Structures are given as C-alpha cells and as structure tokens.
C-alpha cells in the first residue's frame, strides 16, 4: 500500500508521470501566487505521490489505491489522459498575473510582495522594470538584475564541484578540521540547480570560532574579488528550545553570489570567462550535523511529510536542529541521518530517493 507520506516513499529522478506532475506543479504554483494555501497543498501532495510511481499512468484504472488524489486532481489527470494536455495548466501558463509573477520572482531579491507591486503598477517585462527611473531597488535586487542572465542559466555538476573546491579551500584556511558537505538538489542526484548549498561543521571549533567562520570566509573572497553579493544571517537556534510545531528559527547562514572563473570548471566544454553562481553556506554545531544535513538535503515535500509524520504518527517534533519525543519527554541524539530515520521508526530513504 502506497503511503500518504513522502518520507515512506522512494522518489527517484526517473519520473514516469512528468505529463501529470508538470501540470500539477503549475497549478500548485498558481495557488501559491493566488494565496490559496489549501488548494496549493492538495496539488503538491498529488504531484509528489505520482513522482514516486514506478510506471506511467495511462488510464484512470491505474490511479486506483493511490492516496492524495482528490476529485479535483482526478479531473485534471482524466483531461491529460484524454488528449495529452492539461487545459487547466495551459490556461495558467497564458494568465497575465501568473506570467508576471514567474518572470518577476525569477530575479534574485524579488519575492511575492514586490512582484505583486510591479504587476499592479502595470509592469510586464524586466526591461521596463530595470529602465524605470522612479523605481527603487534593494541591494539584493540590484545584484539580481546585474547578474540575471548567469543566475537564470542552470548550475551544472562541474560548476557545483568547482564551487565545492572554492568553499573547501576557503573554509579549511580558517578551520582545517571542518567538514563541508554539498546539500540540496545536487546531493539528491540532480544534474542541475538554481544554486549550490553547503553544510559546514567542525568537531573542535569553539562557539566564537563557529560564529566567525562565515565572516572570515566571505572577507577572504571579498579580498580575492570573488564576492559579488553577501548577506549573513546570524543564528537564531537555541540549544535547549523544543523543535517548531517555522523559518524564523535557523542556523547561521549566508546567501551569496560568487564569481566562478571558467578555468576552475572541469567539464567536456568563450565570453567574459566567469559565471555568477548563487551559493548558500550553513554553519551548524557538530552535535546537530545530522538534523541539519537531513533538513538541508530536501526535497521541500520530503521535509514537510517527515515533520508531519513525526508529529501525527510518532508524537515527535522534528526540526533542522533537533528531534524531541513528547511521550518520553527527551531530545533524541543522532550522529547520522540513519539514526534519525530509526528514531522515527522509518526505513532509511537514501538522498537520491528523497526527490518527492
Ligand atoms: O522538490 C522541491 C520542492 C517540492 O518537493 C514541492 O514543492 O512540492 C525542490 C526542493 C529543493 C530545492 C533545493 C535546493 O536548494 C537546491 C537545488 C539544487 C542544488 C542544491 F545544492 C540545492 C533543495 N530542495
């Protein structure tokens, strides 16, 4: 029996139902843009469960026994089986508000509120936004527009590996015992990504050393002329606080734009000779490295279902920093992701199987 939870499903990158899931992902994204959280969640769960199937849906009979497929979702699947297209997703793709929100938020520094503001001002293209003489842009948006073409082109694995080398070389200069791990989509086996994420931890660093590393590493890159953008968020995580029932609670992290020289990239394959890359660095205390790694590996849907399963099925509270057992009234310790899964009574799901 297919579980309703992504954390009890193996979801690999061989998606046999892209025709259905691309349409469901568009409809979910539109519901996010229309602030319809409930309809958004229903489409996300349906998309997720179809991504896990080991075969393609070719008839309505194939949907029997599959959870998270409500009547609205089954009408969409029926329409795609009919003529290979979703009329509903096609109408979203042609909607003026949807087109504008996708295009405007594709800029680094532009979220829902700024995209909505620009749309209500009558803007429809990035050229008209950038050349307007009345608009005021944040420092994040300025960087987003300046490096737009590089940031909108997919980061590939040779580029992610080139970035990993840069991160490791800079980090070990200040903390030689530090462990640097590439997380996110690339850890799940993806060929491309919009950014490259890293988790940094040190078994012997002090509380102060741990706090200063991201400042030292970014100052070093600034001196090197490689830091195109930098925003460091100080940690809000507390050693003895219960896990959330929240994006306001986090480890020390930074959102960066790095200058990646093409000479550093070892690929099979001209212009300026460098590429702007979005990089996120996360620093965590050594004892919480498994919780942080699990949280930063993703996918978004796998993380949501892990936390939901922990709460509803195990009466446990899971977060990027800890796992708390409400029945035993104790925090559960873990040195690996495997130990976290075992505490939750779940079979271990490999990172490449978390593409929910
Ligand atoms: O799959 C989803 C979302 C669904 O599950 C849903 O909305 O239902 C994307 C989640 C996601 C993206 C990332 C990255 O930041 C990332 C990407 C590439 C390389 C890299 F190093 C980091 C990690 N998790």
GROMACS .gro file of C-alpha atoms and ligand atoms in nm:
model
  380
    1UNK     CA    1   0.000   0.000   0.000
    2UNK     CA    2   0.148   0.340  -0.113
    3UNK     CA    3   0.184   0.566   0.196
    4UNK     CA    4   0.034   0.919   0.201
    5UNK     CA    5   0.374   1.035   0.339
    6UNK     CA    6   0.668   1.115   0.105
    7UNK     CA    7   0.907   1.002   0.387
    8UNK     CA    8   0.761   0.645   0.346
    9UNK     CA    9   0.806   0.652  -0.038
   10UNK     CA   10   1.116   0.620  -0.257
   11UNK     CA   11   1.111   0.904  -0.515
   12UNK     CA   12   1.395   0.883  -0.769
   13UNK     CA   13   1.466   1.117  -1.065
   14UNK     CA   14   1.316   0.870  -1.318
   15UNK     CA   15   0.971   1.035  -1.322
   16UNK     CA   16   0.735   0.836  -1.545
   17UNK     CA   17   0.448   1.085  -1.494
   18UNK     CA   18   0.605   1.422  -1.598
   19UNK     CA   19   0.296   1.500  -1.817
   20UNK     CA   20   0.076   1.492  -1.499
   21UNK     CA   21   0.328   1.633  -1.247
   22UNK     CA   22   0.439   1.931  -1.464
   23UNK     CA   23   0.066   2.033  -1.488
   24UNK     CA   24   0.009   1.973  -1.109
   25UNK     CA   25   0.327   2.174  -1.022
   26UNK     CA   26   0.198   2.469  -1.239
   27UNK     CA   27  -0.146   2.456  -1.072
   28UNK     CA   28   0.018   2.440  -0.724
   29UNK     CA   29   0.246   2.739  -0.810
   30UNK     CA   30  -0.059   2.940  -0.928
   31UNK     CA   31  -0.242   2.863  -0.600
   32UNK     CA   32   0.069   2.986  -0.410
   33UNK     CA   33   0.058   3.310  -0.616
   34UNK     CA   34  -0.322   3.346  -0.551
   35UNK     CA   35  -0.251   3.289  -0.172
   36UNK     CA   36  -0.470   2.970  -0.180
   37UNK     CA   37  -0.255   2.760   0.060
   38UNK     CA   38  -0.508   2.471   0.085
   39UNK     CA   39  -0.551   2.411  -0.290
   40UNK     CA   40  -0.169   2.456  -0.327
   41UNK     CA   41  -0.105   2.177  -0.068
   42UNK     CA   42  -0.355   1.938  -0.238
   43UNK     CA   43  -0.184   1.978  -0.579
   44UNK     CA   44   0.167   1.944  -0.420
   45UNK     CA   45   0.078   1.613  -0.245
   46UNK     CA   46  -0.082   1.471  -0.566
   47UNK     CA   47   0.223   1.572  -0.775
   48UNK     CA   48   0.455   1.415  -0.510
   49UNK     CA   49   0.276   1.077  -0.496
   50UNK     CA   50   0.277   1.046  -0.883
   51UNK     CA   51   0.653   1.127  -0.887
   52UNK     CA   52   0.704   0.810  -0.672
   53UNK     CA   53   0.525   0.571  -0.915
   54UNK     CA   54   0.747   0.310  -1.087
   55UNK     CA   55   0.524   0.319  -1.403
   56UNK     CA   56   0.332   0.588  -1.609
   57UNK     CA   57  -0.046   0.643  -1.557
   58UNK     CA   58  -0.212   0.552  -1.892
   59UNK     CA   59  -0.577   0.505  -1.773
   60UNK     CA   60  -0.796   0.615  -1.478
   61UNK     CA   61  -0.788   0.248  -1.352
   62UNK     CA   62  -0.411   0.295  -1.287
   63UNK     CA   63  -0.498   0.561  -1.018
   64UNK     CA   64  -0.686   0.301  -0.801
   65UNK     CA   65  -0.545   0.278  -0.448
   66UNK     CA   66  -0.314   0.580  -0.494
   67UNK     CA   67  -0.358   0.822  -0.197
   68UNK     CA   68  -0.365   1.209  -0.221
   69UNK     CA   69  -0.574   1.203  -0.542
   70UNK     CA   70  -0.894   1.400  -0.472
   71UNK     CA   71  -1.178   1.466  -0.720
   72UNK     CA   72  -1.024   1.796  -0.849
   73UNK     CA   73  -0.688   1.619  -0.912
   74UNK     CA   74  -0.858   1.315  -1.079
   75UNK     CA   75  -1.042   1.556  -1.321
   76UNK     CA   76  -0.700   1.703  -1.419
   77UNK     CA   77  -0.546   1.353  -1.468
   78UNK     CA   78  -0.855   1.248  -1.678
   79UNK     CA   79  -0.809   1.557  -1.904
   80UNK     CA   80  -0.437   1.479  -1.966
   81UNK     CA   81  -0.519   1.109  -2.046
   82UNK     CA   82  -0.785   1.241  -2.295
   83UNK     CA   83  -0.555   1.444  -2.530
   84UNK     CA   84  -0.206   1.458  -2.368
   85UNK     CA   85  -0.260   1.816  -2.239
   86UNK     CA   86  -0.397   1.992  -1.933
   87UNK     CA   87  -0.644   2.268  -2.036
   88UNK     CA   88  -0.627   2.396  -1.671
   89UNK     CA   89  -0.244   2.422  -1.666
   90UNK     CA   90  -0.249   2.573  -2.023
   91UNK     CA   91  -0.485   2.849  -1.901
   92UNK     CA   92  -0.247   2.922  -1.603
   93UNK     CA   93   0.052   2.943  -1.847
   94UNK     CA   94  -0.139   3.203  -2.054
   95UNK     CA   95  -0.267   3.403  -1.747
   96UNK     CA   96  -0.113   3.755  -1.729
   97UNK     CA   97  -0.076   3.751  -1.345
   98UNK     CA   98   0.089   3.406  -1.342
   99UNK     CA   99   0.333   3.501  -1.626
  100UNK     CA  100   0.433   3.824  -1.446
  101UNK     CA  101   0.481   3.655  -1.108
  102UNK     CA  102   0.704   3.381  -1.259
  103UNK     CA  103   0.909   3.635  -1.455
  104UNK     CA  104   0.948   3.891  -1.173
  105UNK     CA  105   1.032   3.639  -0.896
  106UNK     CA  106   1.296   3.482  -1.132
  107UNK     CA  107   1.508   3.787  -1.023
  108UNK     CA  108   1.722   3.734  -0.712
  109UNK     CA  109   1.576   3.960  -0.440
  110UNK     CA  110   1.221   3.968  -0.579
  111UNK     CA  111   0.950   3.787  -0.385
  112UNK     CA  112   0.569   3.773  -0.389
  113UNK     CA  113   0.507   4.127  -0.249
  114UNK     CA  114   0.745   4.312  -0.489
  115UNK     CA  115   0.620   4.105  -0.789
  116UNK     CA  116   0.254   4.197  -0.696
  117UNK     CA  117   0.352   4.568  -0.654
  118UNK     CA  118   0.516   4.581  -1.001
  119UNK     CA  119   0.222   4.398  -1.163
  120UNK     CA  120  -0.031   4.650  -1.010
  121UNK     CA  121   0.194   4.934  -1.141
  122UNK     CA  122   0.140   4.795  -1.492
  123UNK     CA  123   0.486   4.638  -1.548
  124UNK     CA  124   0.502   4.321  -1.760
  125UNK     CA  125   0.871   4.289  -1.865
  126UNK     CA  126   1.208   4.301  -1.685
  127UNK     CA  127   1.342   4.554  -1.941
  128UNK     CA  128   1.067   4.802  -1.840
  129UNK     CA  129   1.134   4.745  -1.469
  130UNK     CA  130   1.517   4.792  -1.498
  131UNK     CA  131   1.498   5.107  -1.711
  132UNK     CA  132   1.228   5.280  -1.497
  133UNK     CA  133   1.366   5.599  -1.336
  134UNK     CA  134   1.115   5.611  -1.043
  135UNK     CA  135   1.158   5.255  -0.907
  136UNK     CA  136   1.383   5.192  -0.603
  137UNK     CA  137   1.563   4.859  -0.581
  138UNK     CA  138   1.706   4.678  -0.275
  139UNK     CA  139   2.079   4.579  -0.280
  140UNK     CA  140   1.963   4.215  -0.335
  141UNK     CA  141   1.752   4.317  -0.642
  142UNK     CA  142   2.041   4.526  -0.789
  143UNK     CA  143   2.260   4.209  -0.777
  144UNK     CA  144   1.967   4.006  -0.913
  145UNK     CA  145   1.941   4.234  -1.219
  146UNK     CA  146   2.318   4.281  -1.270
  147UNK     CA  147   2.384   3.901  -1.281
  148UNK     CA  148   2.037   3.799  -1.416
  149UNK     CA  149   2.149   3.600  -1.729
  150UNK     CA  150   2.405   3.393  -1.526
  151UNK     CA  151   2.164   3.330  -1.236
  152UNK     CA  152   1.878   3.221  -1.469
  153UNK     CA  153   2.104   2.971  -1.652
  154UNK     CA  154   2.115   2.632  -1.473
  155UNK     CA  155   2.418   2.549  -1.249
  156UNK     CA  156   2.551   2.210  -1.373
  157UNK     CA  157   2.751   1.942  -1.170
  158UNK     CA  158   3.104   2.052  -1.299
  159UNK     CA  159   3.016   2.409  -1.183
  160UNK     CA  160   2.881   2.282  -0.844
  161UNK     CA  161   3.203   2.080  -0.797
  162UNK     CA  162   3.416   2.385  -0.889
  163UNK     CA  163   3.220   2.584  -0.622
  164UNK     CA  164   3.274   2.295  -0.368
  165UNK     CA  165   3.653   2.326  -0.421
  166UNK     CA  166   3.639   2.703  -0.359
  167UNK     CA  167   3.427   2.656  -0.041
  168UNK     CA  168   3.655   2.377   0.097
  169UNK     CA  169   3.979   2.577   0.020
  170UNK     CA  170   3.841   2.890   0.196
  171UNK     CA  171   3.688   2.705   0.496
  172UNK     CA  172   3.997   2.482   0.576
  173UNK     CA  173   4.216   2.805   0.571
  174UNK     CA  174   4.042   2.915   0.898
  175UNK     CA  175   3.911   2.572   1.031
  176UNK     CA  176   4.131   2.281   0.899
  177UNK     CA  177   3.916   2.011   1.074
  178UNK     CA  178   3.588   2.141   0.920
  179UNK     CA  179   3.359   1.906   0.729
  180UNK     CA  180   3.198   2.066   0.421
  181UNK     CA  181   2.902   1.884   0.258
  182UNK     CA  182   2.713   1.975  -0.059
  183UNK     CA  183   2.338   1.954   0.021
  184UNK     CA  184   2.012   2.036  -0.166
  185UNK     CA  185   1.924   1.902  -0.511
  186UNK     CA  186   2.283   1.804  -0.606
  187UNK     CA  187   2.301   1.571  -0.302
  188UNK     CA  188   1.969   1.414  -0.424
  189UNK     CA  189   2.133   1.336  -0.763
  190UNK     CA  190   2.011   1.634  -0.969
  191UNK     CA  191   2.210   1.728  -1.279
  192UNK     CA  192   2.120   2.096  -1.244
  193UNK     CA  193   2.018   2.354  -0.983
  194UNK     CA  194   1.945   2.724  -0.931
  195UNK     CA  195   2.206   2.735  -0.651
  196UNK     CA  196   2.475   2.528  -0.468
  197UNK     CA  197   2.420   2.470  -0.092
  198UNK     CA  198   2.676   2.359   0.167
  199UNK     CA  199   2.667   2.250   0.525
  200UNK     CA  200   2.982   2.333   0.729
  201UNK     CA  201   3.055   2.184   1.070
  202UNK     CA  202   3.367   2.145   1.289
  203UNK     CA  203   3.422   1.887   1.569
  204UNK     CA  204   3.678   2.104   1.760
  205UNK     CA  205   3.576   2.470   1.683
  206UNK     CA  206   3.463   2.691   1.976
  207UNK     CA  207   3.125   2.880   1.985
  208UNK     CA  208   3.313   3.201   1.879
  209UNK     CA  209   3.522   3.024   1.604
  210UNK     CA  210   3.196   2.873   1.468
  211UNK     CA  211   3.035   3.221   1.463
  212UNK     CA  212   3.329   3.396   1.289
  213UNK     CA  213   3.397   3.139   1.007
  214UNK     CA  214   3.132   3.272   0.759
  215UNK     CA  215   3.258   3.634   0.817
  216UNK     CA  216   3.628   3.521   0.766
  217UNK     CA  217   3.548   3.315   0.451
  218UNK     CA  218   3.341   3.595   0.288
  219UNK     CA  219   3.606   3.865   0.375
  220UNK     CA  220   3.872   3.638   0.212
  221UNK     CA  221   3.658   3.609  -0.108
  222UNK     CA  222   3.589   3.988  -0.099
  223UNK     CA  223   3.971   4.043  -0.090
  224UNK     CA  224   4.000   3.787  -0.377
  225UNK     CA  225   3.741   3.979  -0.586
  226UNK     CA  226   3.506   3.677  -0.593
  227UNK     CA  227   3.227   3.805  -0.367
  228UNK     CA  228   2.960   3.960  -0.589
  229UNK     CA  229   2.687   3.956  -0.317
  230UNK     CA  230   2.679   3.863   0.054
  231UNK     CA  231   2.408   3.854   0.325
  232UNK     CA  232   2.493   3.680   0.655
  233UNK     CA  233   2.203   3.578   0.884
  234UNK     CA  234   2.315   3.524   1.243
  235UNK     CA  235   2.192   3.207   1.415
  236UNK     CA  236   1.851   3.209   1.593
  237UNK     CA  237   1.876   2.842   1.703
  238UNK     CA  238   1.873   2.777   2.081
  239UNK     CA  239   2.046   2.465   2.236
  240UNK     CA  240   1.753   2.377   2.469
  241UNK     CA  241   1.446   2.508   2.272
  242UNK     CA  242   1.182   2.250   2.162
  243UNK     CA  243   1.164   2.197   1.779
  244UNK     CA  244   0.891   2.400   1.600
  245UNK     CA  245   0.522   2.285   1.567
  246UNK     CA  246   0.893   2.796   1.131
  247UNK     CA  247   1.161   2.958   0.906
  248UNK     CA  248   1.235   3.217   1.181
  249UNK     CA  249   1.444   2.951   1.369
  250UNK     CA  250   1.776   2.878   1.191
  251UNK     CA  251   2.148   2.811   1.195
  252UNK     CA  252   2.397   3.081   1.095
  253UNK     CA  253   2.377   3.107   0.715
  254UNK     CA  254   2.469   3.326   0.423
  255UNK     CA  255   2.320   3.394   0.082
  256UNK     CA  256   2.596   3.464  -0.167
  257UNK     CA  257   2.674   3.531  -0.532
  258UNK     CA  258   3.023   3.411  -0.623
  259UNK     CA  259   3.239   3.483  -0.927
  260UNK     CA  260   3.327   3.137  -1.070
  261UNK     CA  261   3.622   3.151  -1.312
  262UNK     CA  262   3.584   2.914  -1.609
  263UNK     CA  263   3.941   2.779  -1.564
  264UNK     CA  264   3.826   2.616  -1.235
  265UNK     CA  265   3.546   2.416  -1.416
  266UNK     CA  266   3.644   2.068  -1.541
  267UNK     CA  267   3.372   1.984  -1.794
  268UNK     CA  268   3.370   1.843  -2.151
  269UNK     CA  269   3.324   2.201  -2.287
  270UNK     CA  270   3.411   3.190  -2.497
  271UNK     CA  271   3.261   3.502  -2.324
  272UNK     CA  272   3.362   3.702  -2.009
  273UNK     CA  273   3.541   3.389  -1.874
  274UNK     CA  274   3.341   3.362  -1.549
  275UNK     CA  275   2.987   3.286  -1.425
  276UNK     CA  276   2.787   3.431  -1.131
  277UNK     CA  277   2.664   3.149  -0.905
  278UNK     CA  278   2.415   3.156  -0.619
  279UNK     CA  279   2.572   2.984  -0.317
  280UNK     CA  280   2.429   2.922   0.032
  281UNK     CA  281   2.651   2.831   0.325
  282UNK     CA  282   2.514   2.693   0.655
  283UNK     CA  283   2.722   2.656   0.975
  284UNK     CA  284   2.594   2.427   1.250
  285UNK     CA  285   2.718   2.288   1.586
  286UNK     CA  286   2.885   1.949   1.543
  287UNK     CA  287   2.627   1.756   1.757
  288UNK     CA  288   2.336   1.877   1.534
  289UNK     CA  289   2.503   1.796   1.197
  290UNK     CA  290   2.265   1.501   1.118
  291UNK     CA  291   1.948   1.711   1.179
  292UNK     CA  292   2.087   1.998   0.968
  293UNK     CA  293   2.203   1.761   0.683
  294UNK     CA  294   1.856   1.595   0.681
  295UNK     CA  295   1.683   1.936   0.666
  296UNK     CA  296   1.912   2.086   0.400
  297UNK     CA  297   1.909   1.780   0.172
  298UNK     CA  298   1.535   1.818   0.100
  299UNK     CA  299   1.320   1.792  -0.111
  300UNK     CA  300   1.070   2.054   0.022
  301UNK     CA  301   0.786   1.795   0.011
  302UNK     CA  302   1.000   1.520   0.173
  303UNK     CA  303   1.084   1.762   0.463
  304UNK     CA  304   0.714   1.864   0.508
  305UNK     CA  305   0.599   1.498   0.524
  306UNK     CA  306   0.890   1.398   0.758
  307UNK     CA  307   0.778   1.667   1.008
  308UNK     CA  308   0.407   1.578   0.960
  309UNK     CA  309   0.476   1.203   1.007
  310UNK     CA  310   0.690   1.280   1.322
  311UNK     CA  311   0.403   1.486   1.474
  312UNK     CA  312   0.093   1.287   1.374
  313UNK     CA  313   0.230   0.930   1.380
  314UNK     CA  314   0.509   0.936   1.641
  315UNK     CA  315   0.417   1.233   1.871
  316UNK     CA  316   0.769   1.367   1.796
  317UNK     CA  317   0.880   1.719   1.698
  318UNK     CA  318   1.136   1.741   1.418
  319UNK     CA  319   1.330   2.046   1.304
  320UNK     CA  320   1.672   2.118   1.139
  321UNK     CA  321   1.827   2.141   1.489
  322UNK     CA  322   1.669   1.859   1.693
  323UNK     CA  323   1.420   1.572   1.743
  324UNK     CA  324   1.207   1.583   2.058
  325UNK     CA  325   0.997   1.289   2.191
  326UNK     CA  326   0.685   1.429   2.365
  327UNK     CA  327   0.599   1.091   2.527
  328UNK     CA  328   0.949   1.016   2.666
  329UNK     CA  329   0.998   1.394   2.735
  330UNK     CA  330   1.353   1.371   2.590
  331UNK     CA  331   1.557   1.506   2.298
  332UNK     CA  332   1.681   1.224   2.077
  333UNK     CA  333   2.052   1.221   1.977
  334UNK     CA  334   2.177   1.128   1.626
  335UNK     CA  335   2.522   1.103   1.466
  336UNK     CA  336   2.377   1.021   1.120
  337UNK     CA  337   2.059   1.055   0.913
  338UNK     CA  338   2.013   0.672   0.952
  339UNK     CA  339   1.980   0.717   1.334
  340UNK     CA  340   1.710   0.993   1.280
  341UNK     CA  341   1.509   0.762   1.050
  342UNK     CA  342   1.546   0.475   1.304
  343UNK     CA  343   1.422   0.703   1.593
  344UNK     CA  344   1.113   0.782   1.376
  345UNK     CA  345   1.053   0.411   1.302
  346UNK     CA  346   1.111   0.470   0.927
  347UNK     CA  347   1.309   0.260   0.678
  348UNK     CA  348   1.608   0.462   0.565
  349UNK     CA  349   1.542   0.666   0.246
  350UNK     CA  350   1.866   0.738   0.051
  351UNK     CA  351   1.925   1.107  -0.051
  352UNK     CA  352   1.862   1.022  -0.421
  353UNK     CA  353   1.525   0.869  -0.310
  354UNK     CA  354   1.403   1.194  -0.144
  355UNK     CA  355   1.305   1.371  -0.471
  356UNK     CA  356   0.936   1.398  -0.357
  357LIG     O1  357   1.145   1.938  -0.484
  357LIG     C1  358   1.138   2.054  -0.444
  357LIG     C2  359   1.009   2.110  -0.385
  357LIG     C3  360   0.885   2.016  -0.372
  357LIG     O2  361   0.917   1.892  -0.314
  357LIG     C4  362   0.735   2.075  -0.363
  357LIG     O3  363   0.714   2.197  -0.367
  357LIG     O4  364   0.629   2.004  -0.352
  357LIG     C5  365   1.258   2.149  -0.450
  357LIG     C6  366   1.335   2.149  -0.315
  357LIG     C7  367   1.466   2.179  -0.305
  357LIG     C8  368   1.549   2.260  -0.377
  357LIG     C9  369   1.673   2.260  -0.313
  357LIG    C10  370   1.788   2.341  -0.333
  357LIG     O5  371   1.802   2.447  -0.273
  357LIG    C11  372   1.897   2.302  -0.413
  357LIG    C12  373   1.877   2.271  -0.552
  357LIG    C13  374   1.985   2.230  -0.637
  357LIG    C14  375   2.115   2.220  -0.579
  357LIG    C15  376   2.146   2.248  -0.442
  357LIG     F1  377   2.278   2.235  -0.388
  357LIG    C16  378   2.033   2.290  -0.362
  357LIG    C17  379   1.665   2.164  -0.219
  357LIG     N1  380   1.538   2.124  -0.208
   0.00000   0.00000   0.00000
